[PDB]
Amino acid sequence: PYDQVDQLGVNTLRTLSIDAIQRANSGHPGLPMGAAPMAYVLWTRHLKINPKTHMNWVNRDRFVLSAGHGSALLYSLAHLAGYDVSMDDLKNFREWKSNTPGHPEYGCTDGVEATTGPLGQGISMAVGMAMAEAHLGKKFNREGYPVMDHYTYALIGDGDLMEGVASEAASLAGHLKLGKLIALYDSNGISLDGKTSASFTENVGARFEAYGWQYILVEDGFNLEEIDKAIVQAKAESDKPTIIEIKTTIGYGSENQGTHKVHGSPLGEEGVAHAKEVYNWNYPPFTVPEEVSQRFKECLQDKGVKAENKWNEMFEAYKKEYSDLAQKFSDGFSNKVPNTLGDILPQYGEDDSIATRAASQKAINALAKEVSSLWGGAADLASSNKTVIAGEGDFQPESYEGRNIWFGVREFGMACAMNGIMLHGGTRIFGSTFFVFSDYLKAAIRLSAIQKLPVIYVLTHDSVAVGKDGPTHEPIEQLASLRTIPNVQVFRPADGNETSAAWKVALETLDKPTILVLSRQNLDTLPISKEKVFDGVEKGGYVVQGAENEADGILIATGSEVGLALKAKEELQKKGKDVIVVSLPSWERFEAQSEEYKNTVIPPELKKRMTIEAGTTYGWAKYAGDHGVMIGIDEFGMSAPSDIVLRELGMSVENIVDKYLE
Amino acid sequence: PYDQVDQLGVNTLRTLSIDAIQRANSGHPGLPMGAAPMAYVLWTRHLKINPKTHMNWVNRDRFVLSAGHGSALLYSLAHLAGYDVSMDDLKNFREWKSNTPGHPEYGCTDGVEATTGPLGQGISMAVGMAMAEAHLGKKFNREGYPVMDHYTYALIGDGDLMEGVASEAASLAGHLKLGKLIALYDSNGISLDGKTSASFTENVGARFEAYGWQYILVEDGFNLEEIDKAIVQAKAESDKPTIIEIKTTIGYGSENQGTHKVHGSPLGEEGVAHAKEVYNWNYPPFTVPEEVSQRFKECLQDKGVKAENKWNEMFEAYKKEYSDLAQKFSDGFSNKVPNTLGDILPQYGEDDSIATRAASQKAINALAKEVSSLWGGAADLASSNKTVIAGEGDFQPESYEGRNIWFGVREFGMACAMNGIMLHGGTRIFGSTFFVFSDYLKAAIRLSAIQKLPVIYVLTHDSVAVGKDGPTHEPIEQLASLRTIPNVQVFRPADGNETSAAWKVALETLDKPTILVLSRQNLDTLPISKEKVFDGVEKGGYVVQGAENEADGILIATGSEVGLALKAKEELQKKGKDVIVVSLPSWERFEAQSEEYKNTVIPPELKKRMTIEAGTTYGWAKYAGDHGVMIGIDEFGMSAPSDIVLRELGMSVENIVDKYLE
Numbered sequence A, B: 001p002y003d004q005v006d007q008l009g010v011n012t013l014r015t016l017s018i019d020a021i022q023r024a025n026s027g028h029p030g031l032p033m034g035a036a037p038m039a040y041v042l043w044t045r046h047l048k049i050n051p052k053t054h055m056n057w058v059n060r061d062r063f064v065l066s067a068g069h070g071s072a073l074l075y076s077l078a079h080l081a082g083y084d085v086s087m088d089d090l091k092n093f094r095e096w097k098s099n100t101p102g103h104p105e106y107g108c109t110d111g112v113e114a115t116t117g118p119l120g121q122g123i124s125m126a127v128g129m130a131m132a133e134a135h136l137g138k139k140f141n142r143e144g145y146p147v148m149d150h151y152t153y154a155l156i157g158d159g160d161l162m163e164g165v166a167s168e169a170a171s172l173a174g175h176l177k178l179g180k181l182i183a184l185y186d187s188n189g190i191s192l193d194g195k196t197s198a199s200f201t202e203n204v205g206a207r208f209e210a211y212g213w214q215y216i217l218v219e220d221g222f223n224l225e226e227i228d229k230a231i232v233q234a235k236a237e238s239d240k241p242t243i244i245e246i247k248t249t250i251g252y253g254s255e256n257q258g259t260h261k262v263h264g265s266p267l268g269e270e271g272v273a274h275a276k277e278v279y280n281w282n283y284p285p286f287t288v289p290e291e292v293s294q295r296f297k298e299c300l301q302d303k304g305v306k307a308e309n310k311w312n313e314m315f316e317a318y319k320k321e322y323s324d325l326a327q328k329f330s331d332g333f334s335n336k337v338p339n340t341l342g343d344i345l346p347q348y349g350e351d352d353s354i355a356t357r358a359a360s361q362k363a364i365n366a367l368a369k370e371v372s373s374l375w376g377g378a379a380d381l382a383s384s385n386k387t388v389i390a391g392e393g394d395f396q397p398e399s400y401e402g403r404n405i406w407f408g409v410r411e412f413g414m415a416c417a418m419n420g421i422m423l424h425g426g427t428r429i430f431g432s433t434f435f436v437f438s439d440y441l442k443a444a445i446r447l448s449a450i451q452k453l454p455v456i457y458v459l460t461h462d463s464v465a466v467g468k469d470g471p472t473h474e475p476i477e478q479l480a481s482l483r484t485i486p487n488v489q490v491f492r493p494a495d496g497n498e499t500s501a502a503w504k505v506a507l508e509t510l511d512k513p514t515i516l517v518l519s520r521q522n523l524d525t526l527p528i529s530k531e532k533v534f535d536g537v538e539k540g541g542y543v544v545q546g547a548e549n550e551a552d553g554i555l556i557a558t559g560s561e562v563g564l565a566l567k568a569k570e571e572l573q574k575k576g577k578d579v580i581v582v583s584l585p586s587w588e589r590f591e592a593q594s595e596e597y598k599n600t601v602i603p604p605e606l607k608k609r610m611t612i613e614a615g616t617t618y619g620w621a622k623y624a625g626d627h628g629v630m631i632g633i634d635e636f637g638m639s640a641p642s643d644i645v646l647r648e649l650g651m652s653v654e655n656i657v658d659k660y661l662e
């Protein structure tokens, strides 16, 4: 089944990778040299992709390189596979504006399914991808219409498996019995600092079986047929995700192979030549042997065209027999939402009072009926975040159609899975936990933002108002945390109507993650029209109550502190002080507006400003200005009843009024 | 060995806990009711503590409740054990200013060894504690002087074990063979949202054995003797940390026992009465039966006094035979550092150029000789963070005296272990990774800060200057992230001399974590005296170069951008513009100074300001002011050579000069 042309293919990967790195004078040659055999077997016998259609074929197999530092191998593969990655591209590895960056970047490079620099996330995202395949398979497949049916592959190293987030994801994958997920593990006994025997001596196989994965060992990781048999067995075990440990020699060909020294640095002109001797490789730099492009053409490209063409035909039939179903399938993939979100969403009257977690919960139930692609869940906090999708089932092996995901206490794993689910396509995801524990998943939000995924994060218990649970459960600095991440939108709704609006904007925003920051405690409805709140949230900031005539000043507030600002505006009127009250539910959305529009909300000539938010003042000087005052909380909170914490940490009308008046 | 007085003790814990919660109308009764038997066996037969001396006995056994929501049980225990937690205290659970807060708070409550609200961290910190015991045991114990010899216990639930960070910590504990660590696992089949069978069906036992832990199952978790035998076996297995799974019924006594409904809410007057019926308990609320205080007095308190008194005598001898060793042991525990840090630390001349990661590395080697308590490591990045302690050994089971810790790719687990190590006492810890991956460990920094631990974080590759590794490895928002956490100090040194100074301040600061943010690339030495840099860093911000006479304006910069500001000051002189250049290596340290001192560095009357930092502008308006300009980076970076990234994202003299002049 494997021959010498195949081995020349392996060493084509090795050489493209090492030369790319050498020419860049930057990169990681160990992994390409160790893992080319596994990647070659996978890409030529086991990856159902069609590079002819880039990444548009929704039912292609998904490959993720979790060990993102093996980027050169990936580009090398991509090239030979027929993706739009050219030999010149390989020659521009790590160069300004190349499509071949130091770590893989989704959206940058034809054929790169995920941005995987940060370790552990790549495999955790694949878990996501596999979850979505399973969920959509069950939703939409019919007898004779396997419309969503494909494998998910992650290539991982020792790094990925030390990271906790990967443990969360494997635990969860194991539990959900993702039989179409296969992890290929470049097990080389080396990590960056040295031998894994200095830090990582656990029994991985056993750990994975304890999760409910199938474990397979490939003793000789350079044996192609053995790697091939292993994958065949992985696929045969469709009741369990499978991990294949493939014992490998890092940097094979280097004098330094089997040491950390080949992890992360170019080999150097003589190391390259040396590895080429070992490979008995006498082609010139950056050269594909004809037989190798021929072998890729036949094993990979021709087979991909024919798999997609078959899928396309079957899909024409599917559309004939199940018109309405096929329509939902396409709407899933294309992000269609009804024009009626505004009327679908609940609306709250001037006299209502609701916690924004609970307004969120009602938005979710209203939306779930009308947006069939939506699903999501909570990191064991659905019943406290209020993120149960009433009546819509539980996502589980026996019911993959269920729409409530039970992520468990796995914040980071959850965020990563969301990212994968979104990268996969076909649905809209949301996930929830406490705002204070956004710290556990921050690095995944980061990847949401970089990869431009409209993941929706629902983060409740947004402030010291939490009260009796105490400082560990009371956010202070987490708005700063999330707001500063580029390409995100963070909404902190001030009431029910703001919460519905933010959900609407979350669904309509498709090129960045939307983070909804919500309250435990009830908030009064802002005393103005639903139409005004919707337009104002769409803009990110707006005036809630203007001054009768000329403004003495302006209070700018978010979330639960908008209600405080309204109360202090009243109290301050009674002292001849007429203030504007602005809600700024999203700084990012606000700052994306026209100068003209921004100046109407926060007049540049008005200097007497006060900012009010239950969290750090860091950042607020931007809006408060030289002459403003910053009402916020620059210390940890306390275990006490809610109203007491708020009072003691200065979220009160008295304190706001007093501060304005000095 | 166990009798009916003992069971009355168990149900004393149950009842104190549930009544405390009931009276608070807030708390988590399931775990106290399920886990009282394990906690009772542990505290009365297996916890060598002496509450008579609060938490001053350095060689006491360390108990951590990782499942921090079982706080009421802990207070209940603390009370009966003789800690300074009174019955009135129990009656003030979750009340403003009580010493009995909703989750346990180190420093708040006599007997509480760690702040454990955030799940997974409690056990991860115990791993820390156990690491320090092992390390100091090996450093200081001698024949007939077991001066550091004690167990570490963590009580965990299903939550702790789903979190990735706990996986990092168990992996690592397993590898380090922490035979004195015992984890007690309240395995009740319930998590907050419902049954663990909806999310968490893994084989925990097997997972732990794969880490190299010993696993023991206590089938009937209410059997005291069986829990006792199990702990005895755990201790007998001193080659492996041990986890004891103790099968339990959550909320035992409630009509709702064995369901999630008893997880997190008071039982309600009738649930309490019901559980008291089941327990056949007819004492009034908040009452300890005499036989129970008697049994605690004898099993726990009397035995603790005698263990400490014996230890104190042995320690008087130890001090006689090994005077110099005993002196170091006490200096470890009391944080003594030489007066000569200033001369111990390396110093750099006006013509030198060094990357601050590399200045950091030289500070570490210089300090390690002189500060015997220092140790630390890297999350598999020592060779890239430059945090190898030259010649001082590797921390490993065969060499626990080694001072380089190999944490592996376990950022969060590492931070948590650092926290534990610091809580334990006796050493100064540092740990390192890339600044961009501070996101992985943010939640532990948070706990460093809350618990007031002078943990030292060494976070390198601080900016887009990283270059070819690309956006996933280039920090943008991480200064904001860390600066906004209350009670931390974040230093971003602008050169070698600033880096030594910051290390000095890090060692002298004992009540908060110190975070050192360091460069990959070389930085020129600031053109001023070492003495001036030391005083200026001690103050957090200072003028590097004043204006000849009257200042046209001021550039305020940090880290690598101080050198840019100096170059632009030159370039701007040549256009009749004389500017002040301020280095602000720590905002927090700066803002802790006198108004008077702050005004000398950044004159309030000087309005033409520019701030320059390679990261988000968020926050900077505070210093830039209404009329200032903010030079920073509010987008993800790129894979390109270093100088190109800096240039393209506007970290350049040209761009600084141009911005000043419009």
Ligand SMILES: Cc1ncc(C[n+]2csc(CCOP(=O)(O)OP(=O)(O)O)c2C)c(N)n1
Pocket (backbone or CB within 6 Å): A030, A031, A067, A069, A117, A118, A119, A120, A157, A158, A159, A160, A188, A190, A191, A192, A250, A263, B379, B380, B381, B409, B437, B440
């Ligand atoms: C989260 C995270 N932490 C640290 C790094 C830096 N890093 C890149 S690869 C690696 C170590 C992993 O070595 P392994 O995965 O075994 O790769 P090999 O050297 O085996 O190719 C590290 C620490 C990272 N990329 N992401």
Ligand SMILES: Cc1ncc(C[n+]2csc(CCOP(=O)(O)OP(=O)(O)O)c2C)c(N)n1
Pocket (backbone or CB within 6 Å): A379, A380, A381, A409, A437, A440, B030, B031, B067, B069, B117, B118, B119, B120, B157, B158, B159, B160, B188, B190, B191, B192, B250, B263
């Ligand atoms: C990091 C983190 N995420 C979420 C929570 C909220 N929370 C507290 S306990 C818990 C679930 C754990 O249930 P388990 O540990 O099994 O406790 P039991 O209900 O068994 O007492 C959750 C999600 C938390 N405290 N910390």
Ligand SMILES: [Mg+2]
Pocket (backbone or CB within 6 Å): A157, A158, A159, A186, A187, A188, A189, A190, A191
């Ligand atoms: Mg490796």
Ligand SMILES: [Mg+2]
Pocket (backbone or CB within 6 Å): B157, B158, B159, B186, B187, B188, B189, B190, B191
């Ligand atoms: Mg439980």
